[PDB]
Amino acid sequence: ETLNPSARIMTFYPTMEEFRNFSRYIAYIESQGAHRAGLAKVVPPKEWKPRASYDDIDDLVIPAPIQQLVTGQSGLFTQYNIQKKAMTVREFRKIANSDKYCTPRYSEFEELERKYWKNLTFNPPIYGADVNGTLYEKHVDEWNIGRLRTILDLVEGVNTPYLYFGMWKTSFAWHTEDMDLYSINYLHFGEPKSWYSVPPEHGKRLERLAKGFFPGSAQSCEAFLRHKMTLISPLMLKKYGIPFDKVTQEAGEFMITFPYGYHAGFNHGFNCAESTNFATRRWIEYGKQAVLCSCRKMVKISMDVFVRKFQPERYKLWKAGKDNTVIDHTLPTPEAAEFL
């Protein structure tokens, strides 16, 4: 409650010594209340690089590029995907940097943000999303998205790294992570990626708003936002009193999403991001209480293993369906104890 009361997006600058232990740093940023915003930025030490050069990836295959068709008006939009045939990074880059798809000329972000919400339904861009793989070198032990060594490893999908090749106007709709997990996003290179976040304590208010605007979608599926098709502009969130914050992620910076932190955003132009999910001991309760997509046959993790290992006291009580536990969104992870 006292740590980060404003629930604003916090930016962190760890030293090389702070940065070497990933799981410890997550506990540290939570003791600082970063989780309250639902999104945090981590700028790594200048000496740190996950790869020496991004020169040898032209022939990397993007198995399923998606053309994003957006329909909507007055801040409310639905994004439909059209899967295209496999393309390489070289071909994707040519299309991203071409006169048809390149970033418009602008001065400040506010102008580019305006151009985004004004033009998101025109000239459908291509998103080189959900590419199985990593751009990290094998010797990189610090913050390796391919091997974070968190408690989520107990599961083995959701623990594997994904690549996202963006172009101007490519977007990610309002959503929380699968099983309401944490996510790590590293911007390898290229143009920025802008982000919007709703604090987890206000997450239910966003759902409430989304249900009112898409009632057909709300009846068919209780967790329709997990379809990742719903785009709601910041001006629409302001109109209906939803608290949110924005941040721009530049190349070489990490973004951390927290359990039940709703986020959306867009790519400024040609770029590449690496993403995976992870957990801490705080996530277990969110996983047990997560409202999952019913209509699609989706990412569902059996919580038994986590409850039997970290909550043995509550395991039989939870298996009977008696655990009436109410999640406190403001509370940091138990691992943060050393920083308090």
Ligand X SMILES: CN(C)CCc1ccc(C2CCN(CCc3cnn(-c4nccc5c(=O)[nH]cnc45)c3)CC2)cc1
- Per the annotation, binding residues are 127, 175, 177, 185, 193, 221, 227-228, 263, 293, 295
| Part in contact with Zn ion (CB under 5 A); list of ranges 147-155, 213-221, 240-248, 306-314 | 213-221
CB of 274 closer than 8 Å to CB of 186 = yes
Distance between CA 77 and CA 121 in Å, rounded?
8
Using CB under 6 A as the binding rule, the residues of this chain from 102 to 141 that contact ligand X are 129-130
Cross-strand partners of 111: none
- Which residues line the annotated binding site for Zn(2+)? 221, 227, 293, 295
Is position 35 annotated as part of the catalytic site?
no
What secondary structure letter does DSSP report for 132?
E
Is position 220 annotated as part of the catalytic site?
no
Distance between CA 147 and CA 211 in Å, rounded?
37
Decide if residue 193 touches ligand X (CB under 6 A): yes
Is position 188 annotated as part of the catalytic site?
no
User: Using alpha carbons only, what angle is made at residue 127 by residues 124 and 133, rounded to the nearest 5 degrees?
Assistant: 175
3-state per-residue secondary structure call for 147-201: CCCCHHHHCCCCCCCEEEEECCCCEEEEECCHHHCEEEEEEEEECCEEEEEECHH
Structure tokens that stand for 334 in this block: 């138990």
| Part in contact with ligand X (CB under 6 A); list of ranges 6-14, 21-29, 142-150, 177-185 | 177-185
91 binds, among ligand X, Zn ion, none (CB under 5 to 8 A by kind): none
- Which residues line the annotated binding site for Fe cation? 175, 177, 263
Is position 202 annotated as part of the catalytic site?
no
Structure tokens that stand for 229 in this block: 């098709």
Is position 240 annotated as part of the catalytic site?
no
Binding-site size for Zn ion (CB under 5 A) equals 4
Closer by beta carbon to ligand X, 129 or else 210 = 129
Decide if residue 293 touches Zn ion (CB under 5 A): yes
Cross-strand partners of 278: 182
Is position 177 annotated as part of the catalytic site?
yes
Q: Which residues bind ligand X (CB under 6 A)?
A: 129-130, 164, 172, 177-178, 183, 185, 193, 263, 273, 299
Q: Which residues bind Zn ion (CB under 5 A)?
A: 221, 293, 295-296
Residues noted as catalytic = 157, 164, 175, 177, 263, 275
